[PDB]
Protein: Protein yhbN
Amino acid sequence: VTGDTDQPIHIESDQQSLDMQGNVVTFTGNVIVTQGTIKINADKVVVTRPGGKEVIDGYGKPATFYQMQDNGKPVEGHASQMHYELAKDFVVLTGNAYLQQVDSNIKGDKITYLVKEQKMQAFSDKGKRVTTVLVP
Amino acid sequence: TGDTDQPIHIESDQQSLDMQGNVVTFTGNVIVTQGTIKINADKVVVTRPGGKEVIDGYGKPATFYQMQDNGKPVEGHASQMHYELAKDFVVLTGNAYLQQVDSNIKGDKITYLVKEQKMQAFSDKGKRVTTVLVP
Amino acid sequence: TGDTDQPIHIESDQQSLDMQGNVVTFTGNVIVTQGTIKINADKVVVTRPGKEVIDGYGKPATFYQMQDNGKPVEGHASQMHYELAKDFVVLTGNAYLQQVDSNIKGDKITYLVKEQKMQAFSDKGKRVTTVLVP
Amino acid sequence: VTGDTDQPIHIESDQQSLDMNVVTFTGNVIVTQGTIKINADKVVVTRPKEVIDGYGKPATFYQMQDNGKPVEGHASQMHYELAKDFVVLTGNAYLQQVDSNIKGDKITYLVKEQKMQAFSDKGKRVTTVLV
Structure:
């Protein structure tokens, strides 16, 4: 649902650390962060917000993303890095990035999903390509 | 918030000193306040190894308060305080829980270096640390 | 460390010696001193129960003893008490003992000057307070 | 010692002069009674039944206590009323009694009670030491 980011985030982890001097909240180990309907799993998660502009940040091979769309579209995915920016409504997957859908799957080098604009993208290095399919 | 170097005022029901050994003890409704820092507990045992002091609170639970520079307070609770004045370094252990204006952590051991403004939470291998955020 | 093994110079306005006691009273601007100790009161009374015992009185009466290691003990109360036999002191006020570093206030403060080990109590409803400046 | 106050009062001097009711004594005067030994310069009795008063700078007082510990002293006047066994030192007065050491300006003493008091006039003060 739209406004899913206007939800309290719950983060479970092994360790954590905080930097009150501008905000730099770091979590490590079996990290499972959920907001509203979103579910994210990573090795490490940093979250900055420099006194504002919140930036969640996934790390780990792999790092898994999941969400529920407004229309009831269970859009999953994964990369080496999640980048949920609550500011605009950005997602930057990198590197071995795979996105999905109830139809159009993608796999590339950098996927950029936008919850608001309902739009995706994909990029590839020289020597590497992209991937898509269709639903039967 | 220049609390670090503030006069420390411990108020309680009973005091117990030991000038050789240096094991000053407080029992009853104990309230140690240093500036804006406000610990509550059932027993405080301020101790000095050398000449270097270590305030130790105990309770079910013991509580923590301080007013942050930004005007939003920090409230906490655990089974034990461990305030080392030598480093301005606090240690909430056993059912630890901290609470900023926005966020609230809960783990097993929370460290808080008061000077830098850095927190750390930890869990026993088999348990887990939890956090929520706002808005 | 060696105040009690010294003669005790009291200065008073009045006084009473019960030779069959002793119950040696002192009254009016009473300023008893020993070594460093300067018990100042509105009424002193020294006994030997059957090992000397001093009983200061008057709000507020005071105390001082310099300890073998630089320690300039203070303190005051409405009911002072000293026992030379065990080096025992019992303030009772409006009780408030002090030191170089940390000060204690309450209802009753005992003290074993003997070996420094001290204590302070407060009636149900009152509370003990202590600061500790660097 | 307890019972002196019953003993006869051996007043003795160099010169004396009875009246009708005051007797003077003079020159190296020594009035004793049991173990009491008031030494002075000019003793006088009266009627408030008799009242002994001695004078001198200083007039010494002595009395052996029941416990073997003697009692010294010395003052100007030495007011003594065996009417009620009462004693009074006055002026630069100091009833030494090791352990004790009272040293005031008006030391009062009731022998039968085994009690003492002391006084000072607002300017100087009562000094006592306890050994």
The domain at 1-131 of chain D is CATH 2.60.450.10 (lipopolysaccharide transport protein A fold). Chain D has one domain: 1-131.
